[PDB]
C-alpha cells in the first residue's frame, strides 16, 4: 500500500518543474495517458487537430504502412502534432521525454467498421 | 478490453490549440498524478519547492489542522505553489482545471517517523 508520505509527494510535490515548463508536456502526457507503465514507450505522437479531422484521414490518401500492412492513410494536409521521444538520460521508472512541436502530414492505420484510426504509423 | 479506437484516442489524441500552455498544467498534472481516476478531485495544490524545504515545515509553526487534528505545521516562509481548481465546465471523465500560480505559506499535516508531510491542509 502506498505510504502516506509517498501519497503526499504524488499529490502535492512538483519540485523539478513549473507550469511554465512547456518542454514538460511529453513527460506529463506520457504519464497521464498510461504509456510509462512497465517501461517508457520510446516514441509517441499526439495529434492536436480535432478527432473528426483525424478520423477523416481514413478516407484520404492510401499509402504503404511502415510495417507492410495495407490499411494506412496519409493526411491531405499537415497537422499540428507533438512528438514525444525518450531522452538518452531517461531511465525507468523516471521516464523523461523531449517535446517537439511539429506540423507534418500524418500516416495512420485505420480499422473497424466504420474505419477509424487504430495506429499512428509515421509523420512525413 | 480497451477497443483499438479508444486505444488510439488515449495514445495519440490531444485535440486543442495550445496543448503545452501553462494553462493546461493542472489538466496534465491532475491526470498524471492519478487524481482524476474514478472522479475529479475538485481542489489540489502542487508545491514547487524542494522536498527538503517542504519537510522542514514539520519542524516550524504548529497550527491546528482545518479538521481539528493537531499535527499541522505552517511554513515560516512563502512557497511557490500552483492551485488546481475544477472549472464549471468540468465533469468526469472529462476533468478540467484552472491553473493558478501564487506564493503563499503552506500548512501541512506531518506524520510518521521521521515526521514528514502527509496531507496538504491549506495555504495562507
Ligand atoms: O512517429 C512516430 C513513430 C512511432 N510512434 C509509435 O511508436 C510505436 C512503434 O515505434 P516505432 O515504429 O518507431 O519502432 P518499432 O516499431 O520499429 O519498434 C508505434 O506503435 C506508434 O504508436 C509514434 O507515435 N509516432
Ligand atoms: O488549498 C488546498 C485545499 C485543499 N487541498 C486538497 O483538497 C482536499 C480537501 O479539500 P478541503 O479540506 O480544503 O475541503 P473539503 O473537500 O474537505 O470540503 C485535501 O485532502 C487536500 O489534499 C489542496 O490541495 N489545497
Cell of B88: 464549471
C-alpha of residue B36 to centroid of ligand 1, in Å: 27
In angstroms, how far is CA A90 from the centroid of its own chain? 17
Q: Does A34 touch chain B (CB under 8 A)?
A: yes
DSSP string, B4-65: HHHHHHHHHB--SS-TTSGGGHHHHHHHHTT-SSSS--SEEEEE-S-HHHHHHGGGSEEE--
- Among chain B residues, the shortest Cα distance to A113 is held by B5
> DSSP string covering chain A, please?
---HHHHHHHHHB-TT--TT-GGGHHHHHHHHTT-SSSS--SEEEEE-S-HHHHHHGGGSEEE--TTS-S-EEE-SS-EEEEEEEE-TT-BTTB--EEEEEEEE-EEEEEETTTTEEEEEEEE-
C-alpha dihedral over B11, A22, B23, B19, to 10 degrees? Answer: -30
Please give the Cα distance from A14 to B48 (Å, whole number).
Answer: 5
In chain A, residues with a C-beta closer than 8 Å to the C-beta of B8 are: 108, 116-120
C-alpha cell at B9: 484516442
Experimental method: X-ray
Q: Is the CB of B45 under 6 A from ligand 2?
A: yes
- Given a contact cutoff of 8 angstroms between Cβ atoms, the answer to whether B53 and B70 are in contact is no
Find residues 61-120 of chain A whose CB sits inside 8 Å of chain B.
82, 99, 101, 108, 111-112, 116-120
Residue nearest to atom 21 of ligand 1 (CA): A120
The CA distance from B97 to the nearest CA of chain A, in Å, is 13
- Other Cβ atoms less than 10 A from the Cβ of A2: the count is 9
Which residues of A are part of a known binding site for substrate?
A: 7, 10, 41-45, 66, 85
What is the Cα–Cα distance from A103 to A80, expressed in whole angstroms? 5
In contact, B48 and B99? CB cutoff 8 Å: no
Q: What is the distance between the alpha carbons of residues B64 and B73, in angstroms, rounded to a whole number?
A: 8
Ligand located closest to B43 CA: 2
Buried b / exposed e over A20-37, threshold 16 CB at 10 Å, is ebeebbbbbbbbbbebbe
Q: Going from the N-terminus, what domains does chain A have, and what CATH number goes with each?
A: 1-124 (3.10.130.10)
Active-site entry in B63, B119, B120, B122: B119
Q: Do A13 and B108 touch (CB under 8 A)?
A: no
Resolution (A): 1.5
d(CA A45, CA A54): 13
**Which residues of A are annotated binding-site positions?**
7, 10, 41-45, 66, 85
What is the C-alpha to C-alpha distance for residues A122 and A102, in angstroms, rounded to an integer? 12
| A44 in Cβ contact with A98 (< 8 Å) | no
Would you state the cell numbers that stand for residue B67, as one nine-digit string? 479538521
Q: How far apart are CA A45 and CA B12, in angstroms?
A: 6
User: With contacts defined as CB-CB under 8 Å, which chain A residues touch B13?
Assistant: 46-47, 51, 54
Find, among A59, A62, A88, the residue nearest to A73 by Cα: A62
Amino acid at each position: 500500500k502506498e505510504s502516506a508520505a509517498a501519497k503526499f509527494e504524488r499529490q502535492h510535490m512538483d519540485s523539478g518543474n513549473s507550469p511554465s515548463s512547456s518542454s514538460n508536456y511529453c513527460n506529463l502526457m506520457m504519464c497521464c495517458r498510461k504509456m510509462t507503465q512497465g517501461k517508457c514507450k520510446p516514441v509517441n505522437t499526439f495529434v492536436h487537430e480535432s478527432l473528426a479531422d483525424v478520423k477523416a484521414v481514413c478516407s484520404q490518401k492510401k499509402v504503404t504502412c511502415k510495417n507492410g500492412q495495407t490499411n494506412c492513410y496519409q493526411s491531405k494536409s499537415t497537422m499540428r502534432i507533438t512528438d514525444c521521444r525518450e531522452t538518452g538520460s531517461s531511465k525507468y521508472p523516471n521516464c523523461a521525454y523531449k517535446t517537439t512541436q511539429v506540423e507534418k502530414h500524418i500516416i495512420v492505420a485505420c480499422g473497424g467498421k466504420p474505419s477509424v484510426p487504430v495506429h499512428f504509423d509515421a509523420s512525413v
